[PDB]
Amino acid sequence: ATFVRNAWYVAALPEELSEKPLGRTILDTPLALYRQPDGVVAALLDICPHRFAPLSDGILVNGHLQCPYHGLEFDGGGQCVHNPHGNGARPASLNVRSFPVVERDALIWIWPGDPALADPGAIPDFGCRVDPAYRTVGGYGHVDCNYKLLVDNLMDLGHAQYVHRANAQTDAFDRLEREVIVGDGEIQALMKIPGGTPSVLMAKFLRGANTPVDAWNDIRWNKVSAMLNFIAVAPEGTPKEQSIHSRGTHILTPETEASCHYFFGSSRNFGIDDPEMDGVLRSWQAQALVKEDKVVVEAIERRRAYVEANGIRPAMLSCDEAAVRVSREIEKLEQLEAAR
Amino acid sequence: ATFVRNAWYVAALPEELSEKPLGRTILDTPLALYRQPDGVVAALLDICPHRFAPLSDGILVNGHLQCPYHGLEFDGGGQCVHNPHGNGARPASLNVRSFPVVERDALIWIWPGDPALADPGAIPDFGCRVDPAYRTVGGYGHVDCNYKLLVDNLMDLEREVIVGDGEIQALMKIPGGTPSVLMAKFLPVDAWNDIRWNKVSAMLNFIAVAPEGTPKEQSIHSRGTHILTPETEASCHYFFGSSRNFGIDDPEMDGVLRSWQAQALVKEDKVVVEAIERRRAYVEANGIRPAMLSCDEAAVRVSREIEKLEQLEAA
Amino acid sequence: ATFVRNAWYVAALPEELSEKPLGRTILDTPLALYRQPDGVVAALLDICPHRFAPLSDGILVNGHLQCPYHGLEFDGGGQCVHNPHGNGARPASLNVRSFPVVERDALIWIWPGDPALADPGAIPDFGCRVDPAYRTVGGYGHVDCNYKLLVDNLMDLGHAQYVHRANAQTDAFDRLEREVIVGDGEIQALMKIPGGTPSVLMAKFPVDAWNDIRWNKVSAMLNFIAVAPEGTPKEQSIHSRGTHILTPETEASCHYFFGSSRNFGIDDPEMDGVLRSWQAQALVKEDKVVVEAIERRRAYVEANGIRPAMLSCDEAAVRVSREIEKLEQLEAAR
Numbered sequence: 001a002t003f004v005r006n007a008w009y010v011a012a013l014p015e016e017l018s019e020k021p022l023g024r025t026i027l028d029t030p031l032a033l034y035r036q037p038d039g040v041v042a043a044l045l046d047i048c049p050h051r052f053a054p055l056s057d058g059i060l061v062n063g064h065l066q067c068p069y070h071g072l073e074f075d076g077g078g079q080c081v082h083n084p085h086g087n088g089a090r091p092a093s094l095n096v097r098s099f100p101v102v103e104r105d106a107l108i109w110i111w112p113g114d115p116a117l118a119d120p121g122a123i124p125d126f127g128c129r130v131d132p133a134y135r136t137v138g139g140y141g142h143v144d145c146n147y148k149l150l151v152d153n154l155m156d157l158g159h160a161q162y163v164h165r166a167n168a169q170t171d172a173f174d175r176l177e178r179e180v181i182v183g184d185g186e187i188q189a190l191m192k193i194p195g196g197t198p199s200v201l202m203a204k205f206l207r208g209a210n211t212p213v214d215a216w217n218d219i220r221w222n223k224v225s226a227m228l229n230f231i232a233v234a235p236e237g238t239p240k241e242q243s244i245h246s247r248g249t250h251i252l253t254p255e256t257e258a259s260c261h262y263f264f265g266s267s268r269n270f271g272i273d274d275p276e277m278d279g280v281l282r283s284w285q286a287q288a289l290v291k292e293d294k295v296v297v298e299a300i301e302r303r304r305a306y307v308e309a310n311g312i313r314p315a316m317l318s319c320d321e322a323a324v325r326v327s328r329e330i331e332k333l334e335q336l337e338a339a340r
Numbered sequence: 341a342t343f344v345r346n347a348w349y350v351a352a353l354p355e356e357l358s359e360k361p362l363g364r365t366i367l368d369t370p371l372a373l374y375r376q377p378d379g380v381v382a383a384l385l386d387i388c389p390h391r392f393a394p395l396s397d398g399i400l401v402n403g404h405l406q407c408p409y410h411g412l413e414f415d416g417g418g419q420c421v422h423n424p425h426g427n428g429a430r431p432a433s434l435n436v437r438s439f440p441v442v443e444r445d446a447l448i449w450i451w452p453g454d455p456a457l458a459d460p461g462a463i464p465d466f467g468c469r470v471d472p473a474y475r476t477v478g479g480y481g482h483v484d485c486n487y488k489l490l491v492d493n494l495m496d497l498e499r500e501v502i503v504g505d506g507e508i509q510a511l512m513k514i515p516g517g518t519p520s521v522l523m524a525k526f527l528p529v530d531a532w533n534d535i536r537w538n539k540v541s542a543m544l545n546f547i548a549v550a551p552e553g554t555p556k557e558q559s560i561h562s563r564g565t566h567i568l569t570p571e572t573e574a575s576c577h578y579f580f581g582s583s584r585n586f587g588i589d590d591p592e593m594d595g596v597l598r599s600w601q602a603q604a605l606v607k608e609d610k611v612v613v614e615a616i617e618r619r620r621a622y623v624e625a626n627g628i629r630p631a632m633l634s635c636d637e638a639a640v641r642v643s644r645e646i647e648k649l650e651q652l653e654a655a
Numbered sequence: 656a657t658f659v660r661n662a663w664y665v666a667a668l669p670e671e672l673s674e675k676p677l678g679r680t681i682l683d684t685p686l687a688l689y690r691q692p693d694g695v696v697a698a699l700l701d702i703c704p705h706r707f708a709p710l711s712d713g714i715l716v717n718g719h720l721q722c723p724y725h726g727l728e729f730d731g732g733g734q735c736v737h738n739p740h741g742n743g744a745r746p747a748s749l750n751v752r753s754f755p756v757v758e759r760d761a762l763i764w765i766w767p768g769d770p771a772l773a774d775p776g777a778i779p780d781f782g783c784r785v786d787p788a789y790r791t792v793g794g795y796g797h798v799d800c801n802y803k804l805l806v807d808n809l810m811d812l813g814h815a816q817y818v819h820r821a822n823a824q825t826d827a828f829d830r831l832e833r834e835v836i837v838g839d840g841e842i843q844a845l846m847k848i849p850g851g852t853p854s855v856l857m858a859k860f861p862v863d864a865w866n867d868i869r870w871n872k873v874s875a876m877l878n879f880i881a882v883a884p885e886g887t888p889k890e891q892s893i894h895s896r897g898t899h900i901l902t903p904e905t906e907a908s909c910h911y912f913f914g915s916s917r918n919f920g921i922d923d924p925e926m927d928g929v930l931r932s933w934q935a936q937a938l939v940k941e942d943k944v945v946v947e948a949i950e951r952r953r954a955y956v957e958a959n960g961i962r963p964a965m966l967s968c969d970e971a972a973v974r975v976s977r978e979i980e981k982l983e984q985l986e987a988a989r
């Protein structure tokens with residue numbers, strides 16, 4: 001299974017973690033994730049160095065994670081800080097691997113690769129998630145597809161015209177303007193849908209207003225698989241900076257080669273103290289991101305065996321440029337790492 | 341997967357198909373099966389050319405199946421007839437594979453193999469199924485075993501096995517016979533229980549009873565549809581039914597003759613063939629072969645011809 | 656994948672068997688186990704020689720197991736004794752493999768290997784199990800781990816401190832003392848846990864206590880759990896002799912036969928309760944959880960070339976492990 005290990009991935013949302021460890025597998029690597037008594041999150045390889053028991057089934061003793069099996073204790077650095085057996089000696093072999101963790105932007109980032117290379121400067125900017133001018137809601141979902149399929153999905157936001165048609169269909173779709181801007185290690189796909197009546201969901205954003213709007217659906221990608229979109233609507237022929245908008249957290253982390261973690265969110269500048277608009281956004285997230293898109297990408301994954309065995313290649317359309325560029329960047333990184 | 345792909349297989353019963361596509365895999369090939377607005381059945385490879393989404397999760401748009409993902413639209417021939425995107429150009433690369441498909445004898449036949457070789461004249465004769473001299477009912481079942489195990493079971497049970505070109509017939513007459521319970525009341529007798537196999541796995545039996553020494557064609561009888569189609573190497577689809585010339589207007593009789601367990605496979609035999617399939621690993625690893633009994637003649641013949649069709653297909 | 660096939664394994668408890676066959680796989684070999692009308696247990700390959708049906712889904716007819724599919728009948732030797740078809744001929748090709756079986760000590764022992772080599776003399780001694788001075792109770796558990804992970808567990812019984820916290824905790828356990836004796840194909844870990852107050856379990860039946868365990872190849876263990884007022888001779892204790900016997904099912908799953916044979920309270924049904932309760936919670940639940948968890952981590956450990964780091968409690972389990980691997984590779988030496 002080929003992953004890009006030397007990169008930061010979101011392993012969890014902060015709300016997911018506590019002093020009770022969470023066992024989760026990223027890049028085929030099982031982790032025990034917990035918040036220590038002092039509040040700082042730790043991430044240990046979920047395999048006790050003694051007999052390979054899951055430490056994530058342990059409990060904290062003295063703020064140290066204790067193996068459930070024979071009770072070796074570890075700090076957040078993976079250092080064995082107590083051995084209860086015999087003379088109680090703790091040689092270097094008893095230490096477990098620890099992973100660099102940065103909690104930032106209401107995300108838990110982890111470096112699954114060479115820890116000497118982990119550079120917090122390199123973590124993607126998701127500042128809107130902690131910016132008090134934005135209201136942020138979201139969650140986690142597990143999907144039985146290769147993460148790359150969900151990168152494809154998200155880098156062609158036009159799929160929403162069909163996959164999400166009940167919420168997202170617009171009658172101005174055939175007037176789409178699409179631009180792609182390639183950075184170094186960053187790619188923006190911009191869409192302007194001009195002059196239409198708002199979609200069901202943009203209508204909700206606007207509290208019903210039925211009259212013609214402009215809508216923008218931009219998405220930004222940073223390596224390996226972390227995306228931030230810009231979903232905006234505004235009376236036709238108004239500035240884009242002045243629009244009500246959602247900045248959408250859409251971050252994938254591989255679990256196995258054929259399964260992945262999906263961390264999604266909306267950070268919105270409108271209806272900031274409105275629980276019902278919270279519910280609208282979490283509704284959308286539940287139906288669109290976690291069912292509708294799940295159904296499509298999970299079915300594509302099930303067809304991978306046929307595609308491969310019959311040497312089938314995709315046929316590309318005008319909507320594909322951003323997703324293909326991103327795909328070729330991920331491949332390029334994969335291949336760099338594969339030596340060695 | 342070793343299949344005989346160059347043959348007609350039943351993919352569906354016509355009553356399973358509508359303008360809402362059915363997704364079904366035959367011989368490790370996923371199909372989208374639907375009826376166009378003029379009623380004609382289309383069979384497409386269930387994998388969109390763009391990014392491989394399941395067309396069978398799509399709906400029709402003006403008679404054309406629309407991909408649920410980014411909206412490419414296809415005709416029954418697999419031609420892409422609409423591309424919503426950009427200049428809306430439809431190069432040959434956007435066409436999806438379409439499979440030869442014939443609706444005939446109230447069955448949907450598909451040719452999953454080399455399409456140049458697909459000859460609808462070679463489709464097995466199940467004509468009793470649309471003969472109004474017969475009352476026809478049946479249904480569909482799925483089994484987690486290799487299809488050859490159910491062909492075996494089916495070709496089993498004055499005798500007579502007669503053998504030819506992709507057809508084998510197994511005949512049994514039982515004179516001074518015993519009447520079946522269903523045909524009981526519609527009259528000693530002669531019984532008949534015959535079965536005809538055509539390649540690769542399509543069978544039609546003949547369960548019959550008459551007064552002593554009657555034309556077997558004039559008997560009280562049922563012709564039973566028993567057609568298997570491989571799904572994976574270790575699973576199959578089973579299409580079953582009966583075409584009867586008695587109680588043609590009794591619907592209670594329809595009910596039992598529509599029973600999977602009454603007509604196709606009792607829970608207890610299903611348990612056995614699926615259990616045989618779980619034993620396949622062990623037998624293969626230990627080079628264990630089956631030991632045949634006298635009653636195995638027809639099965640073995642049919643087995644040998646299938647194997648012959650397999651061997652021919654390589655290369 | 657790699658098993659020691661030339662050895663005796665427990666395939667069932669006697670009370671699991673009857674005229675209704677049981678299908679059970681040992682060392683990747685599916686068996687049909689049943690008790691004939693004369694009381695004698697037979698073990699056949701659970702694959703009809705005709706078309707491979709599960710004979711274990713069949714019934715006895717005149718004491719002969721009848722294939723459910725087309726009704727061949729077999730004796731306990733695997734001879735075909737009836738063919739209801741055509742002229743009823745029974746060619747030798749219709750016989751099924753029958754495995755050597757010995758019912759001893761309230762266990763059913765099967766030899767899955769080279770049948771020429773099956774010496775019932777080499778079956779381990781669990782005589783306490785049919786001793787009138789002992790009351791024996793236990794049962795069967797299935798586990799989704801490689802059996803060797805459960806040998807490990809049983810040979811280092813100083814996890815009960817943490818895995819079994821609730822029943823088997825003692826403050827004495829920093830004052831353990833653990834002696835290991837190795838004989839030919841037999842290893843004993845001894846231990847006397849002196850001076851300490853009793854765990855929940857030992858109170859339920861200033862105390863001294865002792866967990867010894869005997870391993871015999873391949874994976875058959877008998878333990879000794881005793882307890883007695885501080886000062887008392889080990890040999891005059893009240894104690895349980897614990898049957899802990901594993902049989903591989905597949906490379907990543909096994910069969911566990913556990914029991915207690917106790918010399919105390921032996922008419923006493925409450926005591927049956929306590930002992931069956933421990934077995935349910937400790938053995939078939941808590942230990943289950945840990946070893947199945949470790950099995951799931953095998954892929955990563957092997958892919959990454961991780962070897963375990965051993966501790967002071969680990970001698971017995973390590974010596975046993977090394978002997979199993981020895982036998983395993985010896986046999987792969989074709």
Ligand SMILES: COc1c(Cl)ccc(Cl)c1C(=O)O
Pocket residue numbers: 157160201217229231246247248249265266284285289
């Ligand atoms: C998938 O991206 C979105 C679209 Cl296309 C419309 C509205 C929203 Cl809230 C999102 C989102 O960020 O989840």
Ligand SMILES: COc1c(Cl)ccc(Cl)c1C(=O)O
Pocket residue numbers: 812815823856866878880895896897898914915933934938
């Ligand atoms: C696992 O072995 C035991 C220990 Cl460590 C304590 C008490 C008992 Cl009853 C047993 C037993 O034989 O199950």
Ligand code: FES
Pocket residue numbers: 048049050051052053067068069070071072
């Ligand atoms: S497995 Fe962790 S202490 Fe033994």
Ligand code: FES
Pocket residue numbers: 388389390391392393407408409410411412
């Ligand atoms: S996958 Fe069918 S149109 Fe994109």
Ligand code: FES
Pocket residue numbers: 703704705706707708722723724725726727
């Ligand atoms: S499979 Fe046992 S008699 Fe046919």
Ligand SMILES: [Fe+3]
Pocket residue numbers: 153159160163164288289293
């Ligand atoms: Fe979507």
Ligand SMILES: [Fe+3]
Pocket residue numbers: 808814815818819937938942
């Ligand atoms: Fe235990």
